[PDB]
Design a protein around this ligand. Structure first.
Ligand code: LLL
Ligand code: MG
Ligand code: MG
Ligand code: MG
Ligand code: MG
Ligand code: MG
Ligand code: MG
Ligand code: MG
Ligand code: MG
Ligand code: MG
Ligand code: MG
Ligand code: MG
Ligand code: MG
Ligand code: MG
Ligand code: MG
Ligand code: MG
Ligand code: MG
Ligand code: MG
Ligand code: MG
Ligand code: MG
Ligand code: MG
Ligand code: MG
Ligand code: MG
Ligand code: MG
Ligand code: MG
Ligand code: MG
Ligand code: MG
Ligand code: MG
Ligand code: MG
Ligand code: MG
Ligand code: MG
Ligand code: MG
Ligand code: MG
Ligand code: MG
Ligand code: MG
Ligand code: MG
Ligand code: MG
Ligand code: MG
Ligand code: MG
Ligand code: MG
Ligand code: MG
Ligand code: MG
Ligand code: MG
Ligand code: MG
Ligand code: MG
Ligand code: MG
Ligand code: MG
Ligand code: MG
Ligand code: MG
Ligand code: MG
Ligand code: MG
Ligand code: MG
Ligand code: MG
Ligand code: MG
Ligand code: MG
Ligand code: MG
Ligand code: MG
Ligand code: MG
Ligand code: ZN
Lengths: 150, 155, 87, 129, 81, 144
RNA sequence: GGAUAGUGGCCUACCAUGGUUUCAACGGGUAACGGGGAAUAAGGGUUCGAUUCCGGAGAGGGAGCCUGAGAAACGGCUACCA
RNA sequence: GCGGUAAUUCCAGCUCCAAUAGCGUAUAUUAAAGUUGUUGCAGUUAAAAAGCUCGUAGUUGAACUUUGGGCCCGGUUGGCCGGUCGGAUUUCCAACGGGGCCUUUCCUUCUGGCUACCAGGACUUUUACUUUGAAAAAAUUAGAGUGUUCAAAGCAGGCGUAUUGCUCGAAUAUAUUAGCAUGGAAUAAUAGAAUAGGACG
RNA sequence: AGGGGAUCGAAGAUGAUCAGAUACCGUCGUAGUCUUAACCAUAAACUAUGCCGACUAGGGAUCGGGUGGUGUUUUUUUAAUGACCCACUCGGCACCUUACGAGAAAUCAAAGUCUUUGGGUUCUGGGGGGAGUAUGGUCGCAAGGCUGAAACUUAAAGGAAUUG
């Protein structure tokens, strides 16, 4: 548990036993699917949105109130990004680390984490290529990474 | 490979003893002999519809399939009108009562009936010696895509 | 411990811990047999008439002999209240 | 991580009857755990077990009488062919008369004695006594 | 110890345990319908905040997040469901 | 979990690891190095004949004091000088020098036998007449 | 195409850039012919097999060849080296 | 470990032990050896965890998808009776397995042949495993038979009407990894419909 | 290779000491000690103790986070706090008592779930010495790092505990 550290922590979300639920929620799939896509229009992430519709509005889990998950809906709606968001913030993070490194190469612990972060990046891509969400030959490139974040 | 020129060799390429009479005017031009290799194997349409020549093609050629018949996946398409397949298989070590992964790389002449790609499993019938390496001949192609379509453009 | 035909052989069919259903063998010297007296109307205890249990050496050493008999006796009728099967 | 679920379950079982306990929680159940527990139950080494329902893999509560000495998994699932079932038994089973080597065959998870009579074999699974 | 009911454990000793480690895992958070009579009606908020919510009409603060459940700003009522 | 790999498919890693490790087994090693044929004074054979160079009394290690009559021998087939021991009482008066002695090991597979150090061999026959039969009276040493 | 009894880079012309390998290629060693089999007797294993049967090689070392259905023969020839 | 002056170990006589036409020895080898450890090792201090993390090959890798139920047919051993001339079979009773139906349910599909496979067309996601079989040299080995006078052997021989012949034998089993054929569908891989380039007609 | 260079201080200089005293102690003091840029890759680099996963037992403390409380403090005035208390729960640095178990023992909550022997996997070791030597390959500017035999030799070396 926790590949790149000794971290044994158990921290997660405990998903409920009720598969339909809550029984107190009105509105409908039309209302939330419309609600999803306006925030995707704004540019929020399935992680950012599902929280937003958890806190502000009345969605316990959007996977239920609509028979599809959040990203699958964005995909069908053309609002899907070209690379998944976990991979995005993986690459987006290493872009900032190596950025701090060009400022100070004296910092060894930074040079160290950059290995672990980039290891994880190459692992995700390898899987994403296996399942064909990214083309075969998709590779994480150092200098071409700053251009994929922005 | 193949896939054009039909004549590209300094030798005039033709089927043996299949004669097109010039005086007898035909609108099909070529008269093209074929057979079905047997062993419950479809002689494919492109072997008939095709314009090609090759005599090592078990459907239109003078080689006959007999003996072993083998499954294996294509690791190399790099040769023109032949290919190499990796048939893996497991080996049992009696002492340890376990298995170890092995493989054997089989060159096999691919008739220009088939479009073969790397990664496609292939069925292969045994034939007379063809080249130095090749004792076997492509017969049936078991994979028509092998993930080819799932790679797609953005939108 | 029977045989070819019929007869029971092999001396000494051993006891069992009533709590854990474990064979209690000759050398288990922390093993124990409890004799609980069955009384009659007006509280007199009827000497020689017993509800008995055997408790393995293991259960006593672990500290479970107390809670084991409490379970073992109450469901046998000698008590109520006290022990809860659920926790 | 987790490799043999069945092994994990046959553990807490043996870790129960070594501590004396008559009830053990196991997670995350299985298809094989079921059929193995079944074979254990039907020959009398456990009581009744209840698969409970979470929405993931489930749990199980197994009641064990104490008649059991050792249950356990054979970790690699070994091919055994009909003539080696004897060989396999003689190693881990206390005496000829009782105990069961239980395994998996194309005819279903079953012990060697049931295997003998049906006369099919398969890969090994575990053992119970 | 040595005998206890695993199938039917006490809900009182259950609710002390960790959300994952109960007999069946489930979330312990809640949903409240929260009121600022400066608005006639309610926006329904999740208990452990993150996003610090506004009411549909005016820009106004219901909660601010913490690690756990949110600080409900100043006067509000709430209905749990 | 006793790091030997358990896998049903780990056969190679299993049989390789043991092949790798038999080198720690000693005379497994000596088997495949050919050390019998390569080094050691005998060819890798039971006995070997040779010729006496000198008669050397060896003083035995503690807690013993003796003078153990031995012979520097040069192996015919081989050419190695090797130093061997003469058994029982006298028996050094049966050899002298330039003689042809049959040697055997000491029965320890190398590894000198006794308070006699560094001597791995023993005299069996001299002049082909079998030191026993000379020590008892059964034979006498050949004329010349 | 030549050649062979015949297939085949067997050889030859033009042509292609291919074929093997950490699933150990390639290389080095073998006091290595391989198999039937042999010893040691919980099982599992370990060790050996020049040698009475089968298969393969060779007739001092190499090549070459005649005769013939059949030999690259050696109790056939020709040459070399010994 | 014996021997430097009373030697239970040397050299001898006497006696006694072990095996016995045999016994000693050197060398290899197997068992002893769970001291090579798949079965089946040890690794804190005896020999032995890389200074630390990453990471390719290798080994390995959570759970879930036909469950349960109802109705037939046919087998082989076991009893309680036996009917009978030691075995004979039907009913009573179990015990283990095999096949087939229906409960929403292809074992490929059509065209007839026939009453279960004929042969022909058209197609079929591919594996590991486990069953059974066919094909498998003798000798060797395990082993039935046979009184080489015993025996290792050998595969002979054994019976009268031994003056004109009769006649049982020369079994069986083992053979494995791969190959072929076949019953199995558990465990474990593998492929499928998602920008539908989807399935059926 | 520059800078820096207070202090301490391998070399070296010495004063004492001893039979000797190239030392211990005293005294001076070069390199060093710091730093910039490049090298080096070793330590008893230690928990002399692989990583992932399941399970097996009580107890009070403690670190960080979170949950509950008609709990105590502050007060300015309920509040809001902020520290404190009590209980629960995850994840941590540890500690006590135990011994169902383990072990040669010292001791171990793992070193337990092992002849009733199988969760996944990496690494190492196979009497002592010769020896971490020779050799070859490779890394380094160098010192050195890595990999790494054999001949021969030898009955013990060795671990924990026990009594003297
Ligand atoms: C602390 N170092 C240890 C070393 O001491 C030793 O440890 C073993 C340990 O592996 C065995 O345990 C192992 O085998 C068990 C089988 N019953 C279960 C799995 C595993 N824990 C223990 N039974 C004995 C220890 N001394 O072997 C493994 C190791 C990691 O090197
Ligand atoms: Mg990790
Ligand atoms: Mg990792
Ligand atoms: Mg965890
Ligand atoms: Mg065993
Ligand atoms: Mg290797
Ligand atoms: Mg080596
Ligand atoms: Mg070593
Ligand atoms: Mg020799
Ligand atoms: Mg001299
Ligand atoms: Mg000595
Ligand atoms: Mg001689
Ligand atoms: Mg030819
Ligand atoms: Mg040779
Ligand atoms: Mg050999
Ligand atoms: Mg063999
Ligand atoms: Mg041979
Ligand atoms: Mg001979
Ligand atoms: Mg010849
Ligand atoms: Mg030459
Ligand atoms: Mg030569
Ligand atoms: Mg010749
Ligand atoms: Mg001759
Ligand atoms: Mg001849
Ligand atoms: Mg010359
Ligand atoms: Mg010569
Ligand atoms: Mg005397
Ligand atoms: Mg003696
Ligand atoms: Mg005497
Ligand atoms: Mg002898
Ligand atoms: Mg095994
Ligand atoms: Mg050991
Ligand atoms: Mg050590
Ligand atoms: Mg370490
Ligand atoms: Mg490394
Ligand atoms: Mg080190
Ligand atoms: Mg799985
Ligand atoms: Mg699984
Ligand atoms: Mg059914
Ligand atoms: Mg064999
Ligand atoms: Mg400097
Ligand atoms: Mg200075
Ligand atoms: Mg000085
Ligand atoms: Mg002194
Ligand atoms: Mg002093
Ligand atoms: Mg000073
Ligand atoms: Mg330390
Ligand atoms: Mg620790
Ligand atoms: Mg170390
Ligand atoms: Mg520890
Ligand atoms: Mg080491
Ligand atoms: Mg040695
Ligand atoms: Mg070293
Ligand atoms: Mg060393
Ligand atoms: Mg070193
Ligand atoms: Mg070197
Ligand atoms: Mg470099
Ligand atoms: Mg150099
Ligand atoms: Zn508002």
């Amino acid at each position: 548990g926790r590949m790149h550290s000794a971290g044994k922590g158990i921290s997660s979300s405990a998903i409920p036993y009720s598969r339909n639920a809550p029984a107190w929620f009105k509105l409908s799939s039309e209302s939330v699917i419309e609600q999803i896509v306006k925030y995707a229009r704004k540019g929020l992430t399935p992680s950012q949105i599902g929280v937003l519709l958890r806190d502000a509005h009345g969605v316990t889990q959007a996977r239920v109130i609509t028979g599809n998950k959040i990203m699958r809906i964005l995909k069908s709606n053309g609002l899907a990004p070209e690379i998944p968001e976990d991979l995005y913030y993986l690459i987006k993070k290493a872009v900032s680390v190596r950025k701090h490194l060009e400022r100070n190469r004296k910092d060894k612990d930074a040079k160290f984490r950059l290995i672990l972060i980039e290891s994880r990046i190459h692992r995700l891509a390898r899987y994403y290529r296996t399942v064909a969400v990214l083309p075969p030959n998709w590779k994480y490139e150092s200098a071409t990474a700053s251009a994929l974040v922005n | 490979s193949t896939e054009l020129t039909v004549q590209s060799e300094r030798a005039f390429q033709k089927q043996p003893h299949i004669f097109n009479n010039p005086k007898v005017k035909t609108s099909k031009r070529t008269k093209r002999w074929y057979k079905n290799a047997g062993l419950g194997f479809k002689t494919p349409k492109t072997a008939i519809e095709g314009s090609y020549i090759d005599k090592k093609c078990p459907f239109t050629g003078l080689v006959s399939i007999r003996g072993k018949i083998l499954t294996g996946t294509v690791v190399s398409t790099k040769m023109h009108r032949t290919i190499v397949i990796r048939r893996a298989y497991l080996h049992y070590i009696p002492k340890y009562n376990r298995y170890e992964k092995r493989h054997k790389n089989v060159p096999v002449h691919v008739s220009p009936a088939f479009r073969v790609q790397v990664g496609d499993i292939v069925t292969v019938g045994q034939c007379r010696p063809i080249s130095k390496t090749v004792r076997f001949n492509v017969v049936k192609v078991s994979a028509a895509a092998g993930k080819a379509n799932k790679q797609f453009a953005k939108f | 411990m029977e045989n070819d035909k019929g007869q029971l052989v092999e001396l000494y069919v051993p006891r069992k811990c009533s709590a854990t259903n474990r064979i209690i063998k000759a050398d288990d010297h922390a093993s124990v047999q409890i004799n609980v007296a069955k009384v009659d109307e007006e509280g007199r205890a009827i000497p020689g008439e017993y509800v008995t249990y055997a408790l393995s050496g293991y259960v006593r050493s672990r500290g479970e002999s107390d809670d084991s008999l409490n379970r073992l006796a109450q469901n046998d009728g000698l008590l109520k209240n006290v022990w809860s099967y659920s926790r | 991580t987790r490799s043999s679920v069945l092994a994990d379950a046959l553990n807490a079982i043996n870790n129960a009857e070594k501590t004396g306990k008559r009830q053990v929680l196991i997670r995350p159940s299985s298809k094989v755990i079921i059929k193995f527990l079944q074979v254990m139950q039907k020959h009398g080494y456990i009581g009744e077990f209840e698969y409970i329902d979470d929405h993931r893999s489930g749990k199980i509560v197994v009641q064990l009488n104490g008649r059991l000495n050792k249950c356990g998994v054979i970790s690699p699932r070994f091919n055994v062919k009909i003539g080696d079932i004897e060989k396999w038994t003689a190693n881990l089973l206390p005496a000829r008369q009782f105990g069961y080597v239980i395994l998996t065959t194309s005819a279903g998870i079953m012990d060697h004695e049931e295997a003998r009579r049906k006369h099919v074999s398969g890969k090994i699974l575990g053992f119970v006594y | 110890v040595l005998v206890q009911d695993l199938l039917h454990p006490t809900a009182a000793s259950e609710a002390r345990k960790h959300k994952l480690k109960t007999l069946v895992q489930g979330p312990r958070s809640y949903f409240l319908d929260v009121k600022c009579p400066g608005c006639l009606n309610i926006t329904t908020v999740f208990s452990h905040a993150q996003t610090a919510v506004t009411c549909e009409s005016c820009s106004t603060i219901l909660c601010t997040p913490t690690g756990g459940k949110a600080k409900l700003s100043e006067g509000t009522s709430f209905r749990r469901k | 979990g006793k790091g030997k790999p358990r896998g049903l498919n780990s056969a190679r890693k299993l049989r390789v690891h043991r092949r790798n490790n038999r080198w720690a087994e000693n005379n497994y090693k000596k088997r495949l190095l050919g050390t019998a044929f390569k080094s050691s004074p005998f060819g890798g054979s039971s006995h070997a004949k040779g010729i006496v160079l000198e008669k050397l009394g060896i003083e035995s290690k503690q807690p013993n004091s003796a003078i153990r009559k031995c012979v520097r021998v040069q192996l015919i087939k081989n050419g190695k000088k090797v130093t061997a021991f003469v058994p029982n009482d006298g028996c050094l008066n049966f050899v002298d020098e330039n003689d042809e002695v049959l040697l055997a090991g000491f029965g320890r597979k190398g590894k000198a036998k006794g308070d006699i150090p560094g001597v791995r061999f023993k005299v069996v026959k001299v002049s082909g007449v079998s030191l026993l039969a000379l020590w008892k009276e059964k034979k006498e040493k050949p004329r010349s």
